[PDB]
Amino acid sequence: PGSMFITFEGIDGSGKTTQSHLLAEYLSEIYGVNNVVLTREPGGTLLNESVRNLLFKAQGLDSLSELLFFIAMRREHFVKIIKPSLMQKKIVICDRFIDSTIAYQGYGQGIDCSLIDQLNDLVIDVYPDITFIIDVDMEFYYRVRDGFYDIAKKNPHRCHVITDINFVHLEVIKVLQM
Amino acid sequence: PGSMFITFEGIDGSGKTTQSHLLAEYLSEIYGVNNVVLTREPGGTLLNESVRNLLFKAQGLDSLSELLFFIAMRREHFVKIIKPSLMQKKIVICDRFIDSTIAYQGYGQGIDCSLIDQLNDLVIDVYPDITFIIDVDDMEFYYRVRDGFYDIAKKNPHRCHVITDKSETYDIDDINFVHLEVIKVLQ
Amino acid sequence: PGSMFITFEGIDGSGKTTQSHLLAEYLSEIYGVNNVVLTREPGGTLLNESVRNLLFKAQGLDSLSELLFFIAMRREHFVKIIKPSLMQKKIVICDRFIDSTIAYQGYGQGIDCSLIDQLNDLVIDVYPDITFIIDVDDMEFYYRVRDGFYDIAKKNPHRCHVITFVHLEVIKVLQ
Amino acid sequence: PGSMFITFEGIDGSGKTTQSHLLAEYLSEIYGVNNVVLTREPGGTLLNESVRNLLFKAQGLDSLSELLFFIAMRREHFVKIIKPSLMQKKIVICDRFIDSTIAYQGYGQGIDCSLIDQLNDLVIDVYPDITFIIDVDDMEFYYRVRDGFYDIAKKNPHRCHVITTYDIDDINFVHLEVIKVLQM
C-alpha cells in the first residue's frame, strides 16, 4: 500500500502496547493483515526475543552494556523486519523504538544523548514517519518523562504527545489521518 | 602481586586458547591460583556465555549487529570481571579481546576500524599490558583477517608481540615452542 | 492491570509445568504478554539455573545444605524477578515455590517444617495469592511428599486449591 | 594426634592465605601431611568451588542471597570436610570462616549480625579453637569491615588473636607470632 513507519512511545504502563495493537487491527482491516507489520523493541526477531529473555533473567547490567544490547538488537530488527517491510511498501508499527532509548538510557541512566543519537544513526537509515508518545525511584521516572517531553519538543515534525483506552485510540487515528 | 592484563589474539585454529591455558598454569604456579584469572570473549559472565550460545545458532546475523553484541558483552565482561580483578592487583589472561574485533569485524567484514576503535574505548578504560598474537605459518576473508592482525601489531609495537608458530633452529613441537616464546616475552 | 501472584505446585510429573504455561497463555491473551511473567524454581535467573544444574549432579548432598541452596536461590529469584514484577502491577505465575520446599525437604527429607517456614519468611515478603496443587497417582519418600502437599493445602485453605480440563478448572477457580 | 580447628581471618590482601599455607606446612612436618587438612571458604569441596566460580561470573547478588549461599556452602564444607577431620583427631586449618561472614555480610553489607550468628549455629556445632586475625595497614565499606574484625576480636578474646623490629620479612614475623600463640 505504501510504506509507513509508525512508532509508539512512553513510560511502561502508559498503554503504548494496547494502542499499538488497536492501531494494527484498524489498519489491518483497511489494508489487509499481510500489509501491516506489528512489532516491538527490544525484540522483534527470534534472536532478539531470546536475548531479551536472557537480559530479564540476568538483571544488574551495567547501563552502557544495556544500551549497547538494545542498539545491537535494533540493528538486527531493523535489517530483518523493519526495513524489508518498508521496501515492500507495508505499514510498520513498532512498540518502543529510538525515543525509549533516549528517555531511559539517556535521561534515566544519564548516558550522553549525543552518543545514543550517534548509535541510533549508525544502525538505522529510516526514521519513523510518525511517533505517538502516550502520556499518563521516583527521580528516575521524573527524568524519563522529561526525556519524552524533550523528545517531543525537539521533534515536532514526527512526535505527537497524546494525554491520558478508547479516547486515546480515537485521537491516535485523528492525528494519523491529517 | 601486581596488576597485569594479558590477551591472546590471532585467527581461529591458531592455538590462542591452548596458549592462554598454558600461561595460566605457568603463572598460577608462580603467583598462586587465586591471583590469576583466566577468561575469554565472547563470554566471561553467565549472561555473556548464554548470549554467545544464542549467537552461535544465529543464521545470517548482520555484521554490524554482531559487532554491537560483542561490544555490549565486552562492556559487561570488563566491568564485572576484568577491571575488578586488576583493581585487586591480580593477573588477568583473556582469550580473545579488542584486537579480534578489529581483525574480524573490521578487516574481515569491512566495518570501519575507526568506529571499532571508538566502541572499544567507549567500553574499556584499561588496555592490555601485553598482547600475544599467535601467527600460523572463503579464503579472501581469511587473508584479510590475517592482514588485520599484522597491521594491529605494526600499529601497536609496545603492546603486541607476534609469535610465529614454527621453531626455526630447534626441533620442538609447535605448542611448546610458542609457549616458550610467550614466557620469553614476559622477562 | 493489578498484581496477582499465582503458583503451581505438586509432585514431579503432575502437569504443573504444562498448566503454568497454559495459564500464562490464557492470561497473556487477555492482559498482554508484557503483563504476564512466567517463571519457575529452582531457577528463574541465569545464576539459579546454573546452580540448579550443579545441584542435580551432586552426590549425597547434606539435606540442610541443599535446603539452604534452594533458599538462597529463592531470595535471588524473589528480589530480581517476582517482587519487581508485582510492584509493576503485573501477574506472576511461578512453577514451584515455597510449598515444594516444604513437601520435598520437610515431609520428604525430614527437615523441620518450622525451620523451612522461617527460612521462607526470611527471603520473601509477599506470599502467593492463589496456589494450585495438581494431584496425581523409593515410594515411602514419594508418598510423604504427596501427603505433604495435601497437608499444606489443609493448613492453608485461604490460599491453596487442589485440582484432581484441569486448565478449565484453574480458570474457573481463578475467577 | 588431637583435634584442632584453626582459622585465618582478616580483609582481602592481609596475607591470610599465605599464613594458612605456611602454618599447614609447619604442622605437616611435625604431625604428618595426612594429619593436617588445609581448606578454605567459600569453597573447600568440588560442589562449593563450582558454586564459587558461578558466583564470580554472576555478579550483583542481593546481599542476603550471598550470605545464604555462603551458609549453604559452609554447611556442606562442615559436613564433608571439617567435622569428619576433627572426628579423626586431625588438625584443620581454614582460610576464611565464620568471622569473615560477620565482617563482610554483617558490618560491610549491613545484615543483622544476630541473624548471621543464628545461621552459623544452624549449620555448625563447633567453633574454631583459635582464630588468627591478620591486621594490615568504596572506602566506607572497607572501614566497616575492618571495624567488624576488631569488634569480633573484642567479643571473642579467648578464640581470636589479632596479629600485627627484627631482621626478617613481615610474612615471617607474622608466621612466627602465629606459631608462638599456638604454643599456649
Residue numbers in the entry:
A (entry chain B): -2 to 133, 151 to 178, 188 to 201
B (entry chain A): -2 to 134, 151 to 200
C (entry chain C): -2 to 134, 151 to 177, 190 to 200
D (entry chain D): -2 to 134, 151 to 177, 182 to 201
The authors write:
The enzyme thymidylate kinase phosphorylates the substrate thymidine 5′-­phosphate (dTMP) to form thymidine 5′-diphosphate (dTDP), which is further phosphorylated to dTTP for incorporation into DNA. The essentiality of dTTP for DNA synthesis makes TMPK a desirable drug target. E. chaffeensis is the causative agent of human monocytotropic ehrlichiosis (HME). The fold seen for EhchA.01616.a/TMPK is as expected for TMPKs: a central five-stranded β-sheet is sandwiched between two α-helices on one side and five α-helices on the other.
